[PDB]
C-alpha cells in the first residue's frame, strides 16, 4: 500500500487503492503533481438521516427505477473517508497556510536526502507545483478528510470534464510517500 501523506497534517490524502494518475493535461504532462480521477461507485449511504442530493430520475427508465445505490466518488467515500468541504475564505489564515504549505513542501524536498542532480529536478518540480495550483485556484473547492484540518490537510479539488465528482488535486513529489509493505525488515 503506497500512501501519500501530507507534510502539514501527516494524514493520508490518497492511497494506491484509489485512483492516482500523473497530471496529464491537454497534450502535455505536468511533473511532480498527480490528479485524481472521479469514479462513481455505489456507496452504502443509507440516506436515513441525510438524503444525499435528492433527485428524481426521469432519464433511464420509468417503472424500473428503484435505486438505493448512491453513486459517489471512490476517493471521497461519505461512509469511509468523508470529505468535508471548505469555501474560499481568502482570509489571512488561509494565505498564511498557502505560504507554509509551499514552505514545508520545499522542506520535504530538502529532507528527502536525494542525490544533487536529482534534487535539481525535484526543485524544478517545486515552482511547477505552485504554478499549476494557481492555475486551478479560482475553481477550487477545498476539501479535507474528516480527520483533517483547514490548516493541515487542506485539499484542493475542482471539476474537470469527465469528472462527475470533485477531481482531487494533489502534489505527487511533495508529499511523504510511504510505501507500506516491508514493515519488519532490516535491509543492510
Amino acid at each position: 500500500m503506497i500512501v501519500y501523506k501530507d507534510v502539514i497534517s501527516g494524514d493520508e490524502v490518497v492511497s494506491d487503492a484509489l485512483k492516482i494518475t500523473p497530471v496529464m493535461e491537454g497534450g502535455e504532462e505536468v511533473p511532480g503533481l498527480f490528479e485524481v480521477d472521479s469514479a462513481m461507485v455505489a456507496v452504502g449511504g443509507g440516506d436515513i438521516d441525510i438524503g444525499c442530493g435528492n433527485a428524481f430520475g426521469g432519464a433511464g427508465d420509468d417503472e424500473g427505477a428503484d435505486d438505493a445505490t448512491q453513486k459517489e466518488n471512490n476517493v471521497s467515500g461519505p461512509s469511509s473517508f468523508a470529505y468535508t468541504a471548505m469555501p474560499f475564505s481568502s482570509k489571512g489564515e488561509f494565505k498564511s497556510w498557502v505560504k507554509d504549505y509551499v514552505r514545508n513542501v520545499r522542506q520535504a524536498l530538502k529532507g528527502s536526502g536525494v542525490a544533487v542532480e536529482d534534487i535539481k529536478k525535484f526543485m524544478e518540480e517545486a515552482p511547477t507545483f505552485v504554478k499549476w495550483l494557481v492555475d486551478k485556484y479560482d475553481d477550487l473547492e477545498f476539501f479535507m478528510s474528516k480527520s483533517m484540518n483547514p490548516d493541515a490537510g487542506l485539499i484542493f479539488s475542482y471539476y474537470k470534464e469527465g469528472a462527475h465528482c470533485p477531481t482531487f488535486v494533489y502534489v505527487k513529489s511533495g508529499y511523504k510517500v510511504v510505501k507500506f509493505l516491508e514493515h519488519h525488515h532490516h535491509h543492510h
Side-chain angles (χ1 to χ4, degrees):
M1 183 182 300
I2 303 183
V3 74
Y4 288 79
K5 285 178 170 293
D6 166 53
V7 183
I8 315 300
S9 53
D11 291 276
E12 299 172 69
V13 300
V14 70
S15 57
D16 71 295
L18 301 177
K19 297 300 297 297
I20 296 179
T21 48
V23 179
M24 297 186 183
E25 298 282 43
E28 61 180 283
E29 70 171 301
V30 184
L33 297 162
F34 73 93
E35 185 171 68
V36 176
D37 298 296
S38 304
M40 301 69 62
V41 298
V43 172
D47 286 69
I48 302 300
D49 179 83
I50 302 178
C52 299
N54 178 26
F56 295 91
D61 197 277
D62 282 277
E63 291 178 59
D66 182 67
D67 188 295
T69 49
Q70 290 287 29
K71 305 293 171 56
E72 215 293 87
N73 184 29
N74 69 93
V75 184
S76 39
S79 306
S80 307
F81 298 97
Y83 288 73
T84 312
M86 284 295 183
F88 288 100
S89 52
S90 303
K91 200 175 183 185
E93 304 82 279
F94 174 74
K95 300 301 183 65
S96 304
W97 177 83
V98 180
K99 296 183 60 172
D100 285 273
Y101 185 73
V102 183
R103 180 183 181 198
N104 293 328
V105 171
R106 282 176 166 151
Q107 303 319 274
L109 270 59
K110 291 172 177 51
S112 59
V114 182
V116 188
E117 301 184 84
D118 291 283
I119 287 297
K120 298 302 184 64
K121 293 298 171 188
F122 203 175
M123 300 296 175
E124 287 174 47
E125 293 168 76
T128 307
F129 305 147
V130 184
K131 177 61 176 59
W132 189 74
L133 297 178
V134 175
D135 275 40
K136 290 76 187 302
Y137 175 77
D138 296 284
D139 298 301
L140 297 179
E141 195 70 294
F142 304 99
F143 289 97
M144 311 175 307
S145 52
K146 199 285 177 177
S147 47
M148 285 168 175
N149 295 270
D151 299 80
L154 187 65
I155 299 172
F156 309 113
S157 303
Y158 69 106
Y159 298 68
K160 56 161 49 173
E161 304 181 284
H164 291 247
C165 305
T167 315
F168 294 90
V169 176
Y170 291 128
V171 183
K172 192 187 68 176
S173 310
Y175 298 147
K176 298 298 182 63
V177 187
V178 185
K179 302 177 67 281
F180 295 121
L181 190 164
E182 302 176 82
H183 184 83
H184 183 81
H185 68 148
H186 192 263
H187 189 101
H188 193 260

